[PDB]
Design a protein around this ligand. Structure first.
Ligand SMILES: [Au+]
Ligand SMILES: [Au+]
Ligand SMILES: [Au+]
Ligand SMILES: [Au+]
Ligand SMILES: [Au+]
Ligand SMILES: [Au+]
Ligand SMILES: [Au+]
Ligand SMILES: [Au+]
Ligand SMILES: [Au+]
Ligand SMILES: [Au+]
Ligand SMILES: [Au+]
Ligand SMILES: [Au+]
Ligand SMILES: [Au+]
Ligand SMILES: [Au+]
Ligand SMILES: [Au+]
Ligand SMILES: [Au+]
Ligand SMILES: [Au+]
Ligand SMILES: [Au+]
Ligand SMILES: [Au+]
Ligand SMILES: [Au+]
Ligand SMILES: [Au+]
Ligand SMILES: [Au+]
Ligand SMILES: [Au+]
Ligand SMILES: [Au+]
Ligand SMILES: [Au+]
Ligand SMILES: [Au+]
Lengths: 169, 169, 169, 169, 169
């Protein structure tokens, strides 16, 4: 047995956080393929979301690795289908992405508060090291994108959506 | 004599498909030079169509080579002049290109159905190997372009046509 | 408008000359594939004619480019099928090729005489620069080949046709 | 057990096709050594057939590998001695080689028809991928050679046989 | 004395053509600096015209060199100030540039007609070699630019002028 200072409550919340990262990965998978449709065709938006799918997957994998390192047991649940089949405009999609990110970020903060109350400094360090700053950086970037997308709608939405995709993404 | 399992019906349809690829080549030749006119001047649209002329020619040449490999006899017909002397906007041109591509693709599918009914698996493989996936890929790309061109017309068609040509093509 | 010192008569004759180069290209296409037949199988003769197809195409493309540069309008006609479906011996084929070349060359000379009468020195230079010397060089080469092919028929035509293809082409 | 969608009929026909490729290999072995005899001495003809021996062997080996991959059982029979001890002229030999190739090719086509009736698309793909086009290419090449050999017999058969071997093979 | 077959009429017209190239150079000098004004600030338009100033100067220098080579005497006149102190929009400027180019081109054609009537084939070659095709190419390019500038005015002239300068020039 290696397990030491690792509460059952932290273990369960780690498994839930894995499910949340894998669900986010799947959402981004769906977002990316929507933007590859012939009737949507925004290559840069596609690559943005498919890159996010991969980051969220890797996030999950790091959590699973840590779960094993601490002597927890990984437990997998169903992955819920993404919340939409079609994602609207780049604007709608980027709003939905930031809502999702803020939910992951809140889950990280809740897990951290749990870690602190359980006096589990390895867990707190792990989150700080690999998750909290990355999520803050990602959210700031999405925020910046959203501001630029919004700036570009004005009178000519098609034009703005095209330019954004060509010159930013 | 090398000829084996090669029906006269397949042979004739191969010669027709050659004529269709060469005609497509000629259409793209005309499309490219229209976009090089001083009063049209869309360099990127020109290069897109002149690249297509060359692919369609090479398509024809591969069919002719296969015709000879199987012991068929190449038979050439007149090449019909393209359907238009002037091709309108990039939008009109890209619509016309996708109509042409869907007609080639239908001809490939009809030749394949013939091959299958004649039990000619070399022909079916040949089409699969070098034509069916290429045409599907090309059509998807045209579809994507058309979506972006359309997105860009909105209120300011000149502006959109220029941007598309500079930033996509 | 860019057009200057460019007569409608020159413009039409340029379009006709394009048709003649594309027709020549198509003839050479047919000549090349005839020599790739399993029952003809003269690899070097094939490569000679397929190289000519490509030169004639490029000739056409240079004419079209010049048509646009001068502010003329390219107009495409049907391309007539080559004059033969089967081309006989290398000798017959090379005779037919030199007849075709002399017809292109006469058309270049007629266009030049037109240019001179219209006082269009850009056109005269263009023809001199890229067409007249090339055609003269090509015809001399064909002439040389024909002399060597003829020398080789004598009593043993098969033998001579094989040697020519292996040691010259 | 790995075996899935793999009929006993396909399995048996695969073993027969292996025997046919190994027999062809052996025939080419005999053809090559006949042309290395001091009283035949046609080095290029020898290398042509010994290269074919090796291709036919490799063909057999790919079939055996696939047999194992699908969970079939390889079963070996006697290899029949080649049909001739002495192979005559390069012409006779090349005719005999094309007869042999057309028999392999018919066996491939029969196995493919079997695959299609058994709804075994892995087998159909395997044949298409590695056998059908290769055999078609090889037969076309033999056909070309035969045409050139025949062209060369005329009045002076020794001369023609020597030239062919030096300048083509 | 080297002078041979070089008429006094050609000599004078060569000196006039030098004055016309130097005047064009000076016009382009003025055009370039207008577009470098802080209240105009179109860097790409500036570089386009300053590059033209240099080409026109070099044109003059080649004419002077040829004048000396033939044993003519260079005679210099006043260079007339450009026709405008301020050049308006990129559109106005490009129209004015094409008017100027068509005037040079007409002068080249008139000098050529003179050369032909004086039976001075060195002069005709010189013009053909270094001036007639270059001017035709330059005019076609200006024509293309003008078409794209015009396409871009539509409703939002400032926007179009900026994009043209950033993405074409
Ligand atoms: Au994607
Ligand atoms: Au993508
Ligand atoms: Au802590
Ligand atoms: Au901490
Ligand atoms: Au903490
Ligand atoms: Au083009
Ligand atoms: Au082009
Ligand atoms: Au099939
Ligand atoms: Au198939
Ligand atoms: Au099929
Ligand atoms: Au060829
Ligand atoms: Au060839
Ligand atoms: Au002339
Ligand atoms: Au001339
Ligand atoms: Au002339
Ligand atoms: Au051998
Ligand atoms: Au050998
Ligand atoms: Au099939
Ligand atoms: Au199949
Ligand atoms: Au298949
Ligand atoms: Au099949
Ligand atoms: Au400047
Ligand atoms: Au500048
Ligand atoms: Au002259
Ligand atoms: Au001349
Ligand atoms: Au002249």
């Amino acid at each position: 047995q290696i397990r030491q200072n690792y509460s059952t409550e932290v273990e369960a919340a780690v498994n839930r956080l894995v499910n949340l990262y894998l669900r986010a990965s799947y959402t981004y998978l769906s977002l990316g393929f929507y933007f590859d449709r012939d009737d949507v065709a925004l290559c840069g938006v596609c690559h943005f979301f498919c890159e996010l799918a991969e980051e969220k997957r890797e996030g999950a994998e790091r959590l699973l690795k840590m779960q094993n390192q601490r002597g927890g047991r990984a437990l997998f649940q169903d992955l819920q289908k993404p919340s939409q089949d079609e994602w609207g405009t780049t604007l709608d999609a980027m709003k939905a992405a930031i809502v999702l990110e803020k939910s992951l970020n809140q889950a990280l903060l809740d897990l951290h508060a749990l870690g602190s109350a359980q006096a589990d400094p390895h867990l707190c360090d792990f989150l700080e090291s690999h998750f909290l700053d990355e999520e803050v950086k990602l959210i700031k970037k999405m925020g910046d994108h959203l501001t630029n997308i919004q700036r570009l709608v004005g009178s000519q939405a098609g034009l703005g959506e095209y330019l954004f995709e060509r010159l930013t993404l």
